[PDB]
Every structure is written in C-alpha cells, then in structure tokens.
Design a binder for this molecule. Structure first.
Ligand code: ZN
Ligand code: ZN
Lengths: 45, 180, 231, 37
C-alpha cells in the first residue's frame, strides 16, 4: 500500500488499492499524496 | 450425513375420458366446491388419503396434496369412482405424477451469500425479495430453496430418486458454506 | 485477406521488429542498427428505449457511469427470445437495477419501485432471467451511508453503523430477514447509543420501515450489545 | 422575500430522489336461452 493524507484533519491514511477514495474518520474525498521520503537536491544558484 | 428428504406434496393428472356437468358433480359430491366465476373446476376433497382434486368439464382432473405416490394413485382412483357413482361414463386412465416436493433439515446454518457467489450460474438470491436461495440444478433438473436456518426444499421432480439425487449432490456444498 | 502490415529491418532481420517510435521526429526507427523504418507519421426500438431510460436515470440523479452500464446491459438483452415480454417497463427497471449493482452503487427494490410501478414479483422473475442471460453472455453495507444522508447523521454515526452491520452479520441469528431491516435497525441502535433524537416513528416513516419491525430488530440487537462496541 | 431552508440538507435531498416513500396522495391515480331469446 501507499501512504496518503486527508484533506482537512491531515491524518495519515496509507489506504490500499480498491479502497476507493475516502478519508477514514471524516468524509473528505480529497487525499494528498504524502511527500516522498527520499532526499532531494537543489543548487542554491 | 444420514439425512434423507421427506416427501411433502405429490401432484398428479388423470384423464376421466368423458365430459362432465360440473353443477351436477358439485351437487352430488359429499365434499365439493364450485364457483364458475372464480375458477372453472369443481374442487372436490376426500378424507382418506387426505387430498384435493380439481375436476374439469373436459373430464381431466388434477389431484394434489398427497404425501406418497401410493396415496396419490389411491386417492385418484377414489375420485374417479365418485364421478362414476354420480353417473358419468368415466374411466381411470393416464395416471401420471407431474410434481414431487420434498424437504429436510441439515442441522446447521448456511452462508447464502457465499454460496450464491460461488455457485452463481445456478443460484439466485435476493434476500429482500425472498429470504431463500433458489438453486437450479442441472442433473437432475431440480429446483432447491435453501435457507439460512439449514432447512431445504426440493421440487420439480417426476420421480422420487431425483429428490434423493439432488440432496446427495447439494449436501457437500451446503457443508462447505456452513456457519457452525 | 492478408492486408496486415508489419515493420521489419531488412539489414537486421535478426528478430521480428524491436523498434522505438519517435513522435517528435514523427518517424519510427529500429533500435539496433538505428535505421528509420517509417516517416511522416500522422497524428427505432433501441433509441426509444434509451430515450425513456435516459429520462428515468436522470430523474433518479444516478451518475452517468451507472446510466451507461444499464444502457449497455439493456442492449445485450434487447429482443432476445427468453425475455418474451414484460412490456418494456420491467426491462427498464431491471436493467437499471443491474447497472446500479454493476456500478457498486446500491438502490433498494423499493426505491426503483418508486420510480416505476413494476408489480413486484413479476419484477423479480424478469430480473433473474436477465441475470441468467448476463452470466450466459460470459452486500448491504453500501446502503448504510445512504440512509444516514436521509437522516443527515454525523460521520462517526455512519462508521459506527458500518461496524455494526459487519458485526451483526457475523453473529448471524435471523440471518437478516432481508438486508433493509438490518441496515435500519443497525442505525437505530447506533443513534440511540448517541444522544441525537430521531425517536422511532420518524425513522420508520422517513425510511419506510414498519415501526414494529424496528423495535423487534432492536430487542435482538440489544441482546448482543456486548460485542458490537467499537471502542 | 424567499426563505432559505437551513436543515442538514440530507433530509431534503432524501425526499428529492427516490425516497422509498410512495403514494400518500392521489392525483389521476386512474329463464333459459329459449325463453330469454
Ligand atoms: Zn480525514
Ligand atoms: Zn535494424
């Protein structure tokens, strides 16, 4: 499974496939994709 | 296992061979009903074997309510004798059993939804419409009504062995979908 | 008769085609010798039925996906022998309820029965034969939130009701006597747990369940209050 | 003026769509042969 976030309560979900799309603990159907864990690099230029 | 289905109702047809005057029949029979406006047949009954006959003007007769094939033929001959006694040139012919109904109890609850999913092409289950699962067996061609309680109804048989055959065939399936 | 074109490298010839296609250059090239394979890559009854069906699903506010599943279904049935009748009212309701099922949406037999008068039992037979045809051409839970809507109940109430339905089905005992009674009773329990009044007659009216039925379900459900508690 | 219904909005919609509630009102609910002859 893959980790997501709720729209409002910002709770961590990590719902799996074939769970459709909804938050547990509230009805918001807007799920954020929960930013990547691995490191990202920039040049200050 | 150990369970064998109990026969509950046998339906048969008989050709009397002559036309009948229904008012006459209804009038002379000891236990008859006849209201032309509701149904076109005299509904006659006898006490032994306890059965009901639907008697038509064409001379055809339907006999139902018997619990055994013996009782069916017996009661049929009896109805024919009554018609004779009333005065028509009736003959007891073409006795044929058209439908046999049986039932039993497997003694455990069944998961109807699982069974319906697994045996989908033979099953029909709409619990809001009717609480039992309708199972249409291919060989033998018998219809079974399966209930959550474990009570089973088998119907559509022309011969007793078909009732017995179907149950033997369904038992393993009912076991696979038990609740306790 | 033949007419199928395949792309093959006359210089390679080793494999069948293994190539890449370059959309920007609009050309297609063998990935091996780097040769260009191609260039200049270019960039009466029914209609009446679907019309009235369209009206029905529309008045029902069902999302187009459901509408179109039912349309598809109905096309398959169409003029076939086995149907042998039903006057076009039974088929439209059947196909609808199908498309609902297949769409994972749920609608009660009563609801559709409110959009169309099908006489009931006749409807069941038609629905079953249609179901058989679909197999030949080869779940209460959803109802629970929908009902809350009708009552406008909080989310926690709804999820509580869901836990209640799963727990009740496992514990068996009356097997449900159709799902509708269980869904409504499950709610009635969950709400009575909480302080929010609907009382009883209001839910029996509103959701069209016999008050006696709700109370009867309530006694047995009350007996198993022990194991139904989520927290 | 016009009045805004303030309810939970769920009840109103339930009545709108298929409600499982029907009827409750009616409007456009729509001598023998020898002597005899
Ligand atoms: Zn949330
Ligand atoms: Zn090449």
């Amino acid at each position: 499974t893959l980790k997501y976030i709720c729209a409002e309560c910002s709770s961590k979900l990590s719902l799996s496939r074939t769970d459709a799309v909804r938050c547990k603990d509230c009805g918001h159907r807007i799920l954020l994709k929960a930013r990547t864990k691995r490191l990202v690099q920039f040049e200050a230029r | 296992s150990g369970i064998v289905p109990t026969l509950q109702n046998i339906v048969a047809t008989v050709t009397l061979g002559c036309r009948l005057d229904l008012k006459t029949v209804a009038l002379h029979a000891r236990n008859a009903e006849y209201n032309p406006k509701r149904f076109a047949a005299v509904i006659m009954r006898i006490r032994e074997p306890k059965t009901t006959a639907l008697i038509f003007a064409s001379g055809k007769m339907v006999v139902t309510g018997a619990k055994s094939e013996d009782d069916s033929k017996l009661a049929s001959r009896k109805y024919a004798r009554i018609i004779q006694k009333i005065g028509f040139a009736a003959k007891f012919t073409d006795f044929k059993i058209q439908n046999i109904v049986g039932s039993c109890d497997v003694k455990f609850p069944i998961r109807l939804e699982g069974l319906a999913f697994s045996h989908g092409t033979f099953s029909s289950y709409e619990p809001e419409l009717f609480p039992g699962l309708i199972y249409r067996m291919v060989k033998p061609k018998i219809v079974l009504l399966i209930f959550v309680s474990g009570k089973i109804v088998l119907t559509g048989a022309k011969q007793r062995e078909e009732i017995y055959q179907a149950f033997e065939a369904i038992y393993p399936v009912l076991s696979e979908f038990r609740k306790m | 008769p033949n007419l199928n074109i395949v792309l093959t490298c006359p210089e390679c010839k080793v494999y069948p085609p293994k190539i890449v296609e370059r959309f920007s250059e609009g050309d297609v090239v063998c990935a091996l010798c780097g040769l260009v394979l191609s260039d200049k890559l270019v960039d009466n009854e029914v209609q009446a039925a679907f019309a009235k069906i369209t009206m029905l699903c529309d008045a029902a506010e069902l999302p187009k996906i459901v509408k179109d599943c039912a349309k598809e279904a109905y096309k398959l049935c169409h003029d076939e022998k086995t149907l042998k009748g039903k006057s076009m009212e039974s088929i439209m309701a059947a196909s609808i309820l199908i498309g609902c099922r297949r769409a994972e949406v749920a609608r009660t037999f009563k609801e559709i029965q409110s959009l169309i008068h099908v006489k009931t039992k006749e409807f069941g037979k038609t629905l079953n034969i249609m179901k058989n045809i679909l197999r030949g051409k080869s779940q209460n839970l959803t109802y629970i939130p929908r009902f809350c809507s009708h009552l406008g109940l909080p989310m926690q109430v709804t999820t509580s009701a869901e836990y209640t339905a799963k727990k009740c089905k496992e514990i068996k005992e009356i097997a449900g006597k159709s799902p509708i009674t269980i869904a409504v009773v499950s709610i009635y329990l969950n709400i009575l747990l909480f302080q929010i009044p609907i009382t009883a007659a209001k839910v029996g009216q509103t959701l069209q369940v016999t008050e006696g039925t709700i109370k009867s379900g309530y006694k047995i459900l009350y007996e198993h209050r022990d194991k139904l508690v989520d927290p | 003026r016009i009045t805004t219904l303030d309810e939970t909005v769920g009840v109103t919609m339930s009545h709108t769509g298929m409600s499982m509630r029907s009827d409750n009102s009616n409007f456009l609910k729509v001598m023998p042969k020898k002597e005899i002859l």
